[PDB]
Amino acid sequence: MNYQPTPEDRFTFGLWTVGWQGRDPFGDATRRALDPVESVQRLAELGAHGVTFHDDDLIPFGSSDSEREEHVKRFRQALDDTGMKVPMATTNLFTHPVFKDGGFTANDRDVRRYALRKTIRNIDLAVELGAETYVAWGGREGAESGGAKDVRDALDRMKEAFDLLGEYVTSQGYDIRFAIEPKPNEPRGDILLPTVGHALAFIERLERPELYGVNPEVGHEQMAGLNFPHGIAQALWAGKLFHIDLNGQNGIKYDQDLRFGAGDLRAAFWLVDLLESAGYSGPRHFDFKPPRTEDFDGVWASAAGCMRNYLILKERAAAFRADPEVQEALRASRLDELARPTAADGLQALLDDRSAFEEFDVDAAAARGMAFERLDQLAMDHLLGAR
Amino acid sequence: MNYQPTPEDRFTFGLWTVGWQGRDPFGDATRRALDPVESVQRLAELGAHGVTFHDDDLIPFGSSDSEREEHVKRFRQALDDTGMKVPMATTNLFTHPVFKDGGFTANDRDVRRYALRKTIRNIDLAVELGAETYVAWGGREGAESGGAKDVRDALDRMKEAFDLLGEYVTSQGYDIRFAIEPKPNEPRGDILLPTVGHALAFIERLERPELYGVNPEVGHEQMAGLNFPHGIAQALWAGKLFHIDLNGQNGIKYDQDLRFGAGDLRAAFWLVDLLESAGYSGPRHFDFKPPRTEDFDGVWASAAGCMRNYLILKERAAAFRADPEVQEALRASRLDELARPTAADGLQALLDDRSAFEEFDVDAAAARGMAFERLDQLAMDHLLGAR
Amino acid sequence: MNYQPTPEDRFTFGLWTVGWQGRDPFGDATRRALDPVESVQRLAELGAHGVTFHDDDLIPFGSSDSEREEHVKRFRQALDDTGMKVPMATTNLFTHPVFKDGGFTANDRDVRRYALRKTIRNIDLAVELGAETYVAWGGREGAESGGAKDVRDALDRMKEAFDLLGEYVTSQGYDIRFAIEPKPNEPRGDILLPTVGHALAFIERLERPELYGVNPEVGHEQMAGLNFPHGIAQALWAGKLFHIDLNGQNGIKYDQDLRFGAGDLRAAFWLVDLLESAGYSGPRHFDFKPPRTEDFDGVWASAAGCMRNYLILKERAAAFRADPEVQEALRASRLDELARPTAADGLQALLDDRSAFEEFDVDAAAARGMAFERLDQLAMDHLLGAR
Amino acid sequence: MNYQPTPEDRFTFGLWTVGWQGRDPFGDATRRALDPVESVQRLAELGAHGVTFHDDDLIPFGSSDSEREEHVKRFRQALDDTGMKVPMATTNLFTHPVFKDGGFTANDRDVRRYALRKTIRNIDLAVELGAETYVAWGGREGAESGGAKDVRDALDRMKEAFDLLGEYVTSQGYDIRFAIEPKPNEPRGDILLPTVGHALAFIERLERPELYGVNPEVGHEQMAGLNFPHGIAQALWAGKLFHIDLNGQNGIKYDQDLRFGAGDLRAAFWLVDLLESAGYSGPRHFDFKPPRTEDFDGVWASAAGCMRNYLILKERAAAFRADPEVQEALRASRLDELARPTAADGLQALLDDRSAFEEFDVDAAAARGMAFERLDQLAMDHLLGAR
Numbered sequence A, B, C, D: 001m002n003y004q005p006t007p008e009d010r011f012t013f014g015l016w017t018v019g020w021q022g023r024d025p026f027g028d029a030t031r032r033a034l035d036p037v038e039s040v041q042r043l044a045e046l047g048a049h050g051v052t053f054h055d056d057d058l059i060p061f062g063s064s065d066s067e068r069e070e071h072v073k074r075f076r077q078a079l080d081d082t083g084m085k086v087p088m089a090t091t092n093l094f095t096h097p098v099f100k101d102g103g104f105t106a107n108d109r110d111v112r113r114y115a116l117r118k119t120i121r122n123i124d125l126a127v128e129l130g131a132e133t134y135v136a137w138g139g140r141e142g143a144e145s146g147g148a149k150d151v152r153d154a155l156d157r158m159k160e161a162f163d164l165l166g167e168y169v170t171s172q173g174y175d176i177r178f179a180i181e182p183k184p185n186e187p188r189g190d191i192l193l194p195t196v197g198h199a200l201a202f203i204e205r206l207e208r209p210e211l212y213g214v215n216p217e218v219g220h221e222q223m224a225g226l227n228f229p230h231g232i233a234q235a236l237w238a239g240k241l242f243h244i245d246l247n248g249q250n251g252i253k254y255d256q257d258l259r260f261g262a263g264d265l266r267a268a269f270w271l272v273d274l275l276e277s278a279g280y281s282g283p284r285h286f287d288f289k290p291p292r293t294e295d296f297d298g299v300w301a302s303a304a305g306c307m308r309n310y311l312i313l314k315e316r317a318a319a320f321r322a323d324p325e326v327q328e329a330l331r332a333s334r335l336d337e338l339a340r341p342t343a344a345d346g347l348q349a350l351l352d353d354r355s356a357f358e359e360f361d362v363d364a365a366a367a368r369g370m371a372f373e374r375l376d377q378l379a380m381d382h383l384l385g386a387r
Ligand SMILES: OC[C@H]1OC[C@H](O)[C@@H](O)[C@@H]1O
Pocket: A090, A135, A136, A137, A139, A181, A217, A245, A287, D026
């Protein structure tokens, strides 16, 4: 009881994750810059299935079109040498000072045109490399002060940018979908579409909604004090869980990005319970930063523990759902009754049913216990291996 | 410079607001129970336009159908004597112990049938009394522990309950819409559809979405650390701001419900700026609790300051938008450019525009300042009357 | 692997905990009122060591002095019949409407005199029943608005109240100490001495500081987003961990009071690691509320899981500290070096040590990894039983 | 009604504030690097009284001792040319990768020796330049994971470091005090002494406590959801408000550092009310970052609005306290009674006073209203200039 990943677990990492050199808003870098080749080799050794990338993780901002190709060719060699895939790719529209007021909602209209052209060039690459999902994190879309952004106009510009992306993909015939990744704040004071629910809502107003879903990340819902497995339940109920970012976060503070398992560990248990019982079948992607305390040995430790923690919690969630005593408890708590329709008899029948009101014994019903605490300690004893 | 409401400002209060007897989770009541008649009289004197009610604020839980009528008739007299309206009404599906695991998503299916029948009886009343909007706050829909609620099944039950309400209203021919009011937590650990964005998303999956919008409340988005005027911008951009609850809240903690102005005062300025410049024309409804320190004189003080603060902030937001120097600033900050389409030239033109990429000077563009701090102190000097 | 408490584990519960009838700020009670006798019997059966009480949990507010005695005598019988102890007692200065603006810092001076007399009468009882610690939670000391409380004057009144308590105990010859329990907010907007650190600071200004320590509670530091085991480390470093309240809390929201283990489970692991390795030897007291979903079977389940979770986490923290690989890791991470003095050579030696500055190789030192991620996955594999 | 600072308002800025080049954890710098000379000139023109500095803001890390002197001499010239003072100085023990696990509590003992020697060299400079206060922000003292730092050992190392600093200052005969600046988190997961209350407590355990106070910052208490004017009240009640950092923050999130007034504006009103009515007479120091949207014109706008907002709020707090109606209200609310001793009659008299218990009419007393809402709208109408 040992927990060894293989490439079939679908574990992926961004280049920026094991590649983060530990430069924070108060500190210089503490690690040198990894070659993308490197990282591909090391990650394949650890059992990973693939990697993801921003355009500028792969090709240095500014690159000519003969360096560009060079970068790509090296990359491609390493994937072919290791068997690693590239399921997902994304654009950096945050680093470069030109992005300081956003990329698709920046007040300057020339910036907003340049954000779309940067994006479209990388969609073509991603498609080349075989990615299925193209993520958009608008981390610079938002404001520090209430008169600097009209939000209605800015959502109009964001819808315009996603609609022209949708056009371009369907005009090229590409098989690629888009996944918006919410974040509530940081590095802007407030970030537009700050949660999964605001990103799901916004999708429903694009021209082609079936092209877009979400990429929620553990630590960014938690940065609003929200229940991340409830978030993901709703995204699954909408049909829009295209991709996920897995990692940890200790409560409402700056975005920590700790390895997956760290943070809220019970939330991580019920998230694995839910992905595996809903049958999510996209990549289990880790968007994490190895703390800057760490050297490169710490880096590969940290990326391994991500995968380990995922497999342990999988095993404990599967044994919980398999346990007859737990399935008895779930009946005692009437989760079987939550899955049945309230009134499949229809409205008229409901309205003529005296047992539904006139002759409903409210006291007898209020007196029933829900038996949730016994059910939740069962879940505790399963996660701790006490069962 | 004086700020006197009239019934044309559309100011409304819930019965439960000035009626709250100050019973908290650690303390007994500190004020006796007001007659609904009372409150109607006192509120009309203060300049209010109307009141709102839960079924059980008006008619005591349990009431026969000859007390029921009695209650209603008294009520009706007071409205006719004062000219007060009833724009909005709502159901109590939280107080009574039968609701302890929810009303439309309670695990027991009999409870869920009884929640719908209670609801439908009050829709008929509301319609009688002339309300235009029927609010649903599911404050007991949610969980304290992750195995006690399957969220996918529970959203299925919530959609079923709202769809049968929609059926019933359109079968009766009623002119009534529904407004879901999010809250992230309290009194459940976590509450389903915790934010405006999750409530907007959920709406898009009902059978008749055009019947449903939102009733956001200041202090409940703030309980997630979210920017309430950005929330309301998005609800306005979706066409779904049916009703609002106005009040204050100091940050991420239990739901304070302070009078409107208290709390985040700058957030209250940019919320009034936005309602009045978007032309919101529903009720300005105050969902607040006069602190339990207060006697009944404190109560009517507190409900007056709600209205005052709203009028002061209206005047300061109007003088800010009217000020030529502020309109110069907003051009300096390129809010005029945020309102223009990014690419009304279309995708092909964008892609053949060299000035959009190949010949876009990114340094010159990154060098421009956005001039937001000068713009935001203008907004500060306007709100403080320093202008 | 089974985890059975005994009275030697020092497990205690307040009467108010298993006794909470589930009345919340939106809902009526869902359970009838337990006799204190009852609770003493049931808790002894579960393995508990004792109970604690507010004056008004035991004797009904208002009680004559012949009911008073009656109450006490019954109580006393049950303790003698079960062997249960009463290590800690406390005053209700929150419920009764007279307390609405506080008890020792209420603006009315007559209230403040009545708070002290209520307190002193219960210190005499507590002493009768054998308690060693007298807790003070000033849950109504604080304000909703900034002009309603001058905080300097209020800390003067709080110091005056604690100094006269100290006088009274040392004039009576009682062996009793006091423990202040911080809470940051709820039911007041803001509560004075909101954290362990503000309560430790305040102690240092009383006349007899050696009489006072703290009673921190898991969920109340977490309500400020603070690291509860770091809090308790500091209280232990000051010599002031007199008593503790154990329970759970999911982040920054209203005070949930979930059973102990729920909430932040990793925080609960490092808190047990720290109490047991520092050798805390007071009561392990559970200040929790069985959710109002629950019937009385749910109640006793919930109070059992408190104790279970504590024993499981004890075992996992002991196996982590006992593991040779973990003790190697802790050397790799230089926790051995953190325990050594920086400069026991003294200031002059430090200043003449060239290896400390002039000839300190800062790059070589920055290059060392701290090896914390490998150390923290070891801790994860120990808590999950994966080791 | 105009609000013009002069050098007598005691307004100071850190070099790092107007000097921040806008490099964030997702973005490059958006402004070039200001010469310290520059900033001194520009700030004197705006009305400032002085500046503050980290060692490494002034002299580039690594500097020889002939560049060192050069740096200092230029600096000195600009102060002499403008009349600017240097009231406060501080050490950078956060940037350099050697600091990645802290400076005075870093696990490596050699680091901790090098942190103290860096510190002591800058105390000598500060003393040269005339500073009265030496701040310590331990922004890298803390941990991301619970086994990486034993907090008891780390507080022992922090006390050792502050005690040897105290020794060195009193051995040199310097007139300099120390001010610890709390922060709850960022850039570490958790930061030791996270609040004012934990920093006040810790002080009481140093060898010479009278040498140390606090430097609270608005936005860092707010990052715990705490009431910053209550914090500062307690620091004033302890005699330990040595210095302050003024700025804004919108709630519990990453450290924004917005100009002073932005953020919680009502909290800023009651903080100015309190500093000016307590007669705080240290520097009003602004620790803020001009957002990275801004060019250098935005920079000097932002630093001006800091000072403006402070003067406006001063005027509004003075007119509130001067208003007879407000002084009537404060009597109605019994703030006069909060300032009187509870029992200056002594314990025995309290205990023999029947009017204090046996014959205390609790109902009559609970029935009194506190009249706080009328008092708080008066405060609202004063801050908005509506009065
Ligand atoms: O999508 C791009 C990635 O870009 C950087 C963000 O910090 C991270 O959340 C994200 O997933």
